[PDB]
Amino acid sequence: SHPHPELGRPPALPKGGLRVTPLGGLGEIGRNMTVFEYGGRLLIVDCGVLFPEEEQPGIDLILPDFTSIRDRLDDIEGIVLTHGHEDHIGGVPFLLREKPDIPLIGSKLTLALIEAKLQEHRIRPYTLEVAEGHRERVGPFDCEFVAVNHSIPDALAVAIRTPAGMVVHTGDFKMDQLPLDGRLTDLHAFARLSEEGIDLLLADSTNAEVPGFVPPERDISNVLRQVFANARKRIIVASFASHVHRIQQILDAAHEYGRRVAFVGRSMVRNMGIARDLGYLKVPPGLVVDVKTLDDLPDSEVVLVCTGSQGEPMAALSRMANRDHQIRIVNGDTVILASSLIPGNENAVYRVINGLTRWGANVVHKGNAKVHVSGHASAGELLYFYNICRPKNLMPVHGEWRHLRANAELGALTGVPHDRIVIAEDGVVVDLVEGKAKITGKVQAGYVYVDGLS
C-alpha cells in the first residue's frame, strides 16, 4: 500500500502524458510543493517551508529539495500559489534566488503577502494576478482558477487542462457555508468540471480522520462575545497573523463592547496592515489604535491582538508569559488563544499557558472553549466534495500517512476504484497516461536546511 522501497528513476514521459511529482507535503505536513510536467515543460504548484521538530542552531527553515528541477530551471513556465500561508509560499524566495524571472501566479492577497516577504530578500518577481473564474494559458498548461474557502481569504484551487486530461489541485480548503466574506468554496464550478471530466484530483488530507463537519467560523463570535462580556480588565488575544476572519471577529467583539484595539508583534502589524489596506479586513473608524496609547486607557477598554499562539519563544505571548515584554501580565488579565494547537507545539504552548496562569491571567483556549475551528475539510465535507467531483483518479496530498490513508478510504467510499487511488510520498513520480494514474518512479526529495543562506 506504500511506494516500492526501490523505485528507480522514472522512465521517459510518454508523449501526450502528464507527470506529477510531489516534492513536499506528503508524509509530513509542510514545505508543500508539486511539480507538473507536460511536453518537457514544468508548472510548479506551491513552494512552502517546513518547520523543524525543536531543532537548535544551524537549522531554521526546511525546504523542498530542488535537485530534480535545478538543471532544468529554464523549463519552468510558472509557480502557482494557491494561498498565502508560509507552508505554501515560504520556499519561493529560495527558488527565485536560482532563477529570478519565474512568474508568480496567484490571488491579490496571496501576491501581496509573497511580495512583502520577497522585498526583504531584495527580489522583485514577475507576477500574474488571477481571481476565481480566470482562465489563463501558461505554456502548455491551461489553468482555470476556482474559489475555495479556507483559514486565510482569497485562497484558490486550480484546474490544469493539458492533452493528458484535466488535473484538479484543491490547495488547502474547507467548505464553510456561512463565510464572513460570503466567498464560498465554489461547488458549481467543481460540478461543471466534474461533468467535463476530472481525470486526476489532488486533495487536502489534513482533516480527513475527523468525522463529521467543521463548525462555521462565525460561531466563534458567540464565544468571543461571552468572554468579552464577562472580562472586567484587559483582554489579550493571540492568533496566527494571517487569520483575517478570526481577527475580524475579534474587532467586531471589541467594537460591540466599547473597547479599542492595538496590534502587537511584527507579523501581526504587517499582515493586518496589508489586509486592511486591501479591504479584506473591515475596520470601523476609531477602533484600532497604537499600542503606546493603551497605557492611558482604563484596562476595561483595552484589547491587544498579538502574535505567538504556538508558543514561539520570540513572539509576544511567550515574552509576556516570561516577564520579558513591554506588556506586563497582571492578575485579572484575560488571555485568549484563538488558535489551533499544532501537534508538536504542545510543550511550548502549555509552557506559555502555565506562565500566564502563574501571573494570574484567565486563559481561554481551544481546550476549554470553542475559540477555534479547523481551516481544512473534515471527513463529511470530503465525502460531499468527492461526490461532486467524481474524479477518475485520486491523489491525497498535504498529510502524514494516517491522513493520506484516511482520505484515500473516503475516496473509495464514494466509488473511486481502489486501483485509481494513489498514495505517494515526497519524490514519488506519478504518470497520467491514457486517463490512468500510476506510480512510475521516484526522484531525490530529502530535507534541505536553511539559515537564510542555505
Add this chain to the structure above:
RNA sequence: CGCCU
C-alpha cells in the same frame, strides 16, 4: 497543520 523575528 502554520511560523516568528
